[PDB]
RNA sequence: CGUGAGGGAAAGGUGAAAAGAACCCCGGGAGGGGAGUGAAAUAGAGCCUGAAACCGUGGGCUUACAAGCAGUCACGGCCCC
RNA sequence: GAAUGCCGGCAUGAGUAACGAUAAAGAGGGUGAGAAUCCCUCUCGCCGUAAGCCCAAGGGUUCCUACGCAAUGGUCGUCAG
RNA sequence: CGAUGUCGGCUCGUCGCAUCCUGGGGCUGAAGAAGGUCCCAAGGGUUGGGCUGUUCGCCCAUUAAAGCGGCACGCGAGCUGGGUUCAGAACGUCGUGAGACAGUUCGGUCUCUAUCCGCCACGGGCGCAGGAGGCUUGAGGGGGGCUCUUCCUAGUACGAGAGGACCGGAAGGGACGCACCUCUGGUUUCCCAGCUGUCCCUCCAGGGGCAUAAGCUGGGUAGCCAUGUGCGGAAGGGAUAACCGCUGAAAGCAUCUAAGCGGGAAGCCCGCCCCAAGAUGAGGCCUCCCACGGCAGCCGGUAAGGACCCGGGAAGACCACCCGGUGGAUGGGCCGGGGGUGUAAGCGCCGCGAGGCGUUGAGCCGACCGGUCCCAAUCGUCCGAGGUCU
């Protein structure tokens, strides 16, 4: 299920 | 694995390890007795010994082969007249390898003189 | 060893010149056809006006394979091509005549019909 | 039970009915019995076998007593074999007759320490789309923190090979009791020259 | 990679642990039977120039 | 013991002797059992044998022909018993022990590479003078 | 250190007196061991005192079927006064 | 006793990664307390629109010779910017 | 929130069972074959492809089947980075604007080093009350566990016909697994040949280096290998599930049950294969050494035996394992065979010549199968019982 990245990527 | 494999490889690639054989040869063929490490030694029995013989066989083809390896003219005509000729009636080992009891310093590798017998 | 993507040489005038398979049809998840087996395939290229024409699927034995087939008696046959021919769901060929040789494999897998039209078996 | 030492020869193929068979040749015979285990002394049935003459000069004294108290020349090997009670005191190729199938045990060969693709067959990485230094890999080894761990028995990378392996239900192709050969349809395992065990075989 | 690191410091009674492995083991020596230094197995004597009986090299 | 010679002695059963020496390049003509139905009959398949790998009693030979437009090789034991008899055809002179490179060229270029070996011809027909 | 404006450290103590260790020994040297100086030299210049973390040698007790915020209470064994 | 505090010292990771282009080395002789590593010779390999040569910047004695090897040199060092 | 990396994919599994298939079964509006429906069953299996970032889904071609879920929507110190969340840019749209959007579009930095636990492998130590060399038992554990088609029975039972069996018996497959290298098919860094440029040896001829860490090309032994070959899943015994019974009261009938007994699954236990006595519950058998000196203890020399060292090995990262160490075939050489290459150099002949022909299947020649003491495994050293008590 697509959902938000939370956190970006490093 | 190395399932019944024959020949080391001295961490050098072809070209390099064949040249490091030839001048082995060279040089103990020139000086009766050489010093190196040890499995360089072990090497060098085989690749010298086979030249000795062909230098026992004297025909011109012989001489022909030999020089792909050895090249000098004079060592290899020292080889046909003076060496391979002490070694008419020995078959094979032509070359000893004893080991030494000192370690090089600079790295620990152990030494090992390789000759021309008797 | 055909398989799905493997183009085949048509060997008989149903007017198919190359097929290209797509499924081997031996049990749930073969992954080779070879000599007598069956395929479905694709008529990817054809002759104006035959049975087939480009577009069909249809079934083929495949009668000649580049990989080689091993014997019983030690011995293997080995062909230029791969080439099979079309057949409907009875395993006779929906053509007439069948051209070059064939394995002989065929006969022991009741392609009778296409093993006698061949002008050599191998 | 019947059961015997031998050495692995080689491979070849013979023919049969205009039929190729793949064979590998066994050297068999002959074994002199040494021990008989019994169920009064022992506790199971089977027979102890020798097999290859011994360099005496070789063989120490705790060994040459036991040769000894069988009245048997020194042998390079002992190997028994299970719930096998031969008349003789001595086993050869005889007890096979060509048509038997038997089952025969040696030491595979040894790839020494593996990696997952060769020892089990791992699927490994891609070679490209962007594969980065993972293509013999084996790819993850569990979950998360359920449970937390990697079960015991994981297929991993490490030695494989030089293990006992028993191949079953060889067909005995032909025995040649002149020489000792026992000839065996199929693949047997092991190196040329590797010791093996060829019993009767348990399949019906 | 996410640059893994020891996670606590190793105590010495870890780390001394760890070493239980790593004494050498003196060099293995027998006497030359000709001058009865004491030396390698194997190797011609440094002291005397000796192996198999011989004068091997001048020492 | 002698692994090799256990082989061989193994192997000495089945050796055959009676059939003709030949080389790569050279035309050769193998008389083949063959089963159909319900009986068992002569093929003969003749070719250019473009390959003999050597491995004593387990040496094999390839021989290749083409066939109503197609490529065909067969590859045989060289001491099978379904091998009736072997005729040479014509002896080709190769410069090659193995001459795949054939499979590629048209039936004019091969004929020029592989020239009649006019030396082995001669040396057959010198044998084939008998008493 | 910074192109520059500019930033900007660390670093004190032999002994009353140099009496700062002639000479010998091992060692290429460094270093040490004797000899000598001094009230004192683990005050010897890498110098007053010389803590602690940390590294070691030697000794006592202990430990290879055991489950641990490492202690605590109890009993027993061994070693010491 | 804690401020991802400040300053200093010393641990851990660890005898681990690494030792900086995969152009490549081998032997004999010399020197020396000590030599894979310095000198010499022969053999081998690499560059050769350069990895050769000459100028300008910048650098500032690094040049040459003698005597040295604590440290600097990613190892060694008798050698050396 | 002094960071619990986030969709999809790959890789690797493991579990649940509300079972997709395969096995067992009851009911059926079950003649047969095929179905429906429920029950038992998690051992195994559960395909390849087009579309899309997709998960999902649709579609093609097959299949016994193409199951659904959990494991941080399993798995980014394992990979990816197509998708969504940064900065660029454009469309639509909203906003005067700067800009904006649970819209679209093209682009866009994913960290060499594993301390602890865990996992795969391998050792070192000590123990297993004398010390040793062998051979073993198997507590316990792991591996495996799939399935189809055809033919016979028989065109029989059943059926107006089409169609079409139970049971029993054969043969042949797919995928998977372990082993193997005879064959087939790879590789084979120098085993052979051919070839170009250049430098060189020595002018010719013949050769050597370099062109890659093989210059290129044609081949190719052993080895390691799959696309190749052999073999495996069982059989069989035991106990069961659902379900079917026998005998049988309570309850004069009936009832598979309350006493008792039977049948009954790909499942369960055994059976097969592998590990396995650190199985500290440290097992057993065979053989060998021996009751040595000084003071259940220490020190010393030995015994059987062991290690060290060496030559090696289809064993191997080191370690370990195995073989051998002159009473020797362990490696190296040499010889013979195999095997590869494919007819060396030199000479003779023919040709103006490039070349050609003969000598010649020549010459060269790794590893394979062997022989042979020519070379080297010289010479040796050190450990190691004296057997506690009822
Ligand atoms: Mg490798
Ligand atoms: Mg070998
Ligand atoms: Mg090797
Ligand atoms: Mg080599
Ligand atoms: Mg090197
Ligand atoms: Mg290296
Ligand atoms: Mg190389
Ligand atoms: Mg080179
Ligand atoms: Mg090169
Ligand atoms: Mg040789
Ligand atoms: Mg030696
Ligand atoms: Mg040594
Ligand atoms: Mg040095
Ligand atoms: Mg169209
Ligand atoms: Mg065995
Ligand atoms: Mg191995
Ligand atoms: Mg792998
Ligand atoms: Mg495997
Ligand atoms: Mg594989
Ligand atoms: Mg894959
Ligand atoms: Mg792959
Ligand atoms: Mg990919
Ligand atoms: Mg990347
Ligand atoms: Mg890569
Ligand atoms: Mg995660
Ligand atoms: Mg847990
Ligand atoms: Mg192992
Ligand atoms: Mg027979
Ligand atoms: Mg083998
Ligand atoms: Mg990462
Ligand atoms: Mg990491
Ligand atoms: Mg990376
Ligand atoms: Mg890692
Ligand atoms: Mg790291
Ligand atoms: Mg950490
Ligand atoms: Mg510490
Ligand atoms: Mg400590
Ligand atoms: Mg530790
Ligand atoms: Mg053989
Ligand atoms: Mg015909
Ligand atoms: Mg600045
Ligand atoms: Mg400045
Ligand atoms: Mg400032
Ligand atoms: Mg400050
Ligand atoms: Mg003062
Ligand atoms: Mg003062
Ligand atoms: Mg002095
Ligand atoms: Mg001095
Ligand atoms: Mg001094
Ligand atoms: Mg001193
Ligand atoms: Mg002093
Ligand atoms: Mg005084
Ligand atoms: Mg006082
Ligand atoms: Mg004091
Ligand atoms: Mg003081
Ligand atoms: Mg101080
Ligand atoms: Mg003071
Ligand atoms: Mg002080
Ligand atoms: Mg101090
Ligand atoms: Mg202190
Ligand atoms: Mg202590
Ligand atoms: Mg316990
Ligand atoms: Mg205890
Ligand atoms: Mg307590
Ligand atoms: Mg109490
Ligand atoms: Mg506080
Ligand atoms: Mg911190
Ligand atoms: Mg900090
Ligand atoms: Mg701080
Ligand atoms: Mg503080
Ligand atoms: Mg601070
Ligand atoms: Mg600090
Ligand atoms: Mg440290
Ligand atoms: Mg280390
Ligand atoms: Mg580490
Ligand atoms: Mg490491
Ligand atoms: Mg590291
Ligand atoms: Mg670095
Ligand atoms: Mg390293
Ligand atoms: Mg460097
Ligand atoms: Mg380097
Ligand atoms: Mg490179
Ligand atoms: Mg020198
Ligand atoms: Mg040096
Ligand atoms: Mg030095
Ligand atoms: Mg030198
Ligand atoms: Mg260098
Ligand atoms: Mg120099
Ligand atoms: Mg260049
Ligand atoms: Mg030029
Ligand atoms: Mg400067
Ligand atoms: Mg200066
Ligand atoms: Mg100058
Ligand atoms: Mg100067
Ligand atoms: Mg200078
Ligand atoms: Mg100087
Ligand atoms: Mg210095
Ligand atoms: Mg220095
Ligand atoms: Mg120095
Ligand atoms: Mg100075
Ligand atoms: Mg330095
Ligand atoms: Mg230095
Ligand atoms: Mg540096
Ligand atoms: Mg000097
Ligand atoms: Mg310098
Ligand atoms: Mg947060
Ligand atoms: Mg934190
Ligand atoms: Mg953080
Ligand atoms: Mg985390
Ligand atoms: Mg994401
Ligand atoms: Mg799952
Ligand atoms: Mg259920
Ligand atoms: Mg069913
Ligand atoms: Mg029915
Ligand atoms: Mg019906
Ligand atoms: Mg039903
Ligand atoms: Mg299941
Ligand atoms: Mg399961
Ligand atoms: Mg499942
Ligand atoms: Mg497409
Ligand atoms: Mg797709
Ligand atoms: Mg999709
Ligand atoms: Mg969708
Ligand atoms: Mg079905
Ligand atoms: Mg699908
Ligand atoms: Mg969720
Ligand atoms: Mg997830
Ligand atoms: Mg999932
Ligand atoms: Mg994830
Ligand atoms: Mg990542
Ligand atoms: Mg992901
Ligand atoms: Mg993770
Ligand atoms: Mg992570
Ligand atoms: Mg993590
Ligand atoms: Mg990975
Ligand atoms: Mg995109
Ligand atoms: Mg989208
Ligand atoms: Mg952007
Ligand atoms: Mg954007
Ligand atoms: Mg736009
Ligand atoms: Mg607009
Ligand atoms: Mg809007
Ligand atoms: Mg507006
Ligand atoms: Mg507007
Ligand atoms: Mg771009
Ligand atoms: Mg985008
Ligand atoms: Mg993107
Ligand atoms: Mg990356
Ligand atoms: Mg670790
Ligand atoms: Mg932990
Ligand atoms: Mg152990
Ligand atoms: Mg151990
Ligand atoms: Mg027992
Ligand atoms: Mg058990
Ligand atoms: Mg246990
Ligand atoms: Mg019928
Ligand atoms: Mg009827
Ligand atoms: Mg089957
Ligand atoms: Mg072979
Ligand atoms: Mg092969
Ligand atoms: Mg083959
Ligand atoms: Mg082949
Ligand atoms: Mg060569
Ligand atoms: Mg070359
Ligand atoms: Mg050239
Ligand atoms: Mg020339
Ligand atoms: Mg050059
Ligand atoms: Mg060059
Ligand atoms: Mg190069
Ligand atoms: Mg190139
Ligand atoms: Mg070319
Ligand atoms: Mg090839
Ligand atoms: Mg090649
Ligand atoms: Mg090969
Ligand atoms: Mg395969
Ligand atoms: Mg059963
Ligand atoms: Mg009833
Ligand atoms: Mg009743
Ligand atoms: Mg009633
Ligand atoms: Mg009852
Ligand atoms: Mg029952
Ligand atoms: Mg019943
Ligand atoms: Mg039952
Ligand atoms: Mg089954
Ligand atoms: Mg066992
Ligand atoms: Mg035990
Ligand atoms: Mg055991
Ligand atoms: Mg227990
Ligand atoms: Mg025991
Ligand atoms: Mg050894
Ligand atoms: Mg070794
Ligand atoms: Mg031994
Ligand atoms: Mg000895
Ligand atoms: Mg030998
Ligand atoms: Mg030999
Ligand atoms: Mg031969
Ligand atoms: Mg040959
Ligand atoms: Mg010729
Ligand atoms: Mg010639
Ligand atoms: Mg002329
Ligand atoms: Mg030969
Ligand atoms: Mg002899
Ligand atoms: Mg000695
Ligand atoms: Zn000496």
């Given at each position: ?10 | ?39 360089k ?11 000795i ?17 050895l ?7 020292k ?5 391979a ?16 009891a ?17 | ?15 198919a ?12 998840n ?93 | ?8 020869v ?20 002959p ?38 108290k ?135 | ?13 870890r ?25 390698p ?19 | ?38 009986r ?31 490529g ?37 270029e ?22």
């Amino acid at each position: 299920v697509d959902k938000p990245d939370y956190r970006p990527r490093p | 694995m190395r399932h019944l494999k024959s020949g080391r490889k001295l961490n050098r690639h072809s070209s390099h390890r064949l040249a490091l054989y030839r001048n082995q040869a060279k040089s103990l063929l020139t000086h009766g007795r050489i010093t190196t490490t040890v499995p360089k030694a072990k090497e060098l029995r085989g690749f010298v010994d086979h030249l000795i013989h062909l230098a026992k066989r004297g025909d011109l083809h012989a001489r022909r082969l030999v020089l792909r390896d050895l090249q000098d003219v004079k060592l290899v005509r020292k080889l046909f007249d003076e060496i391979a000729p002490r070694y008419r009636d020995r078959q094979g080992g032509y070359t000893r390898v004893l080991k030494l009891a000192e370690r090089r310093r600079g790295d620990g590798a152990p030494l090992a003189l390789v000759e021309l017998v008797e | 060893m055909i398989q799905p993507q493997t183009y085949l040489e048509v060997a008989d005038n149903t007017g198919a010149r190359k097929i290209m398979c797509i499924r081997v049809l031996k049990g749930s998840n073969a992954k080779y056809a070879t000599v007598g087996d069956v395929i479905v395939a694709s008529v990817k290229e054809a002759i104006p006006r035959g049975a087939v024409k480009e577009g069909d699927v249809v079934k083929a034995v495949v009668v000649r394979t580049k990989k080689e087939i091993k014997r019983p008696d030690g011995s293997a046959i080995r062909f230029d091509d791969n080439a099979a021919v079309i057949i409907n769901n009875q395993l006779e060929p929906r053509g007439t005549r069948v051209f070059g040789p064939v394995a002989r494999e065929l006969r022991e897998k009741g392609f009778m019909k296409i093993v006698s039209l061949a002008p050599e078996v191998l | 039970m019947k059961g015997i030492l031998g050495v692995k020869v080689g491979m070849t193929r013979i023919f049969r009915d205009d039929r190729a068979v793949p064979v590998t040749v066994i050297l068999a015979g002959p074994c002199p019995v040494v021990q008989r285990r019994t169920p009064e002394k022992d506790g199971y049935t089977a027979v102890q076998l020798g097999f290859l003459p011994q360099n005496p000069k070789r063989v120490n004294r705790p060994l040459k007593g036991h040769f000894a108290k069988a009245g048997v020349e020194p042998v390079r090997i002992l190997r028994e074999i299970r719930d096998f009670n031969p008349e003789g005191d001595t086993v050869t190729v005889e007890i096979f007759k060509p048509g038997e199938r038997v089952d025969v045990t040696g030491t595979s060969k040894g790839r020494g320490f593996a990696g997952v693709m060769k020892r089990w067959n791992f699927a490994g990485g891609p070679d490209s789309h962007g594969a980065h230094k993972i293509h013999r890999h084996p790819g993850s080894i569990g979950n998360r923190k359920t449970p937390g761990r990697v079960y015991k028995g994981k297929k991993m990378a490490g030695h494989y090979g030089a293990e006992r392996v028993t191949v079953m239900n060889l067909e005995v192709v032909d025995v040649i009791p002149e020489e000792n050969l026992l000839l065996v349809k199929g693949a047997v395992p092991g190196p040329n020259g590797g010791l093996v065990i060829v019993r009767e075989t348990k399949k019906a | 990679a996410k640059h893994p690191v020891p996670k606590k410091k190793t105590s010495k009674a870890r780390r001394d642990a760890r070493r239980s492995h790593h004494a050498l083991t003196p060099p293995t020596l027998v006497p030359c039977p000709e001058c009865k230094a004491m030396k390698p197995p194997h190797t011609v004597c440094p002291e005397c120039g000796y192996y198999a009986g011989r004068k091997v090299l001048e020492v | 013991m002698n692994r090799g010679a256990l082989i061989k002695l193994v192997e000495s059963r089945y050796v055959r002797t009676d059939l003709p020496e030949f080389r790569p390049g050279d035309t050769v003509r193998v008389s083949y059992k063959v089963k159909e139905g319900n009986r068992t009959r002569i093929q003969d398949f003749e070719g250019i044998v473009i390959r003999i790998r050597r491995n004593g009693f387990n040496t094999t030979f390839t021989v290749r022909k083409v066939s109503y437009g197609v490529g065909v090789e067969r590859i045989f034991p060289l001491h099978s018993p379904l091998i009736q008899k072997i005729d040479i055809v014509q002896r080709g002179r190769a410069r090659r022990a193995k001459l795949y490179f054939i499979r590629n060229l048209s039936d004019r270029e091969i004929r020029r590479k592989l020239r009649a070996d006019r030396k082995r011809i001669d040396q057959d027909r010198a044998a084939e003078r008998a008493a």
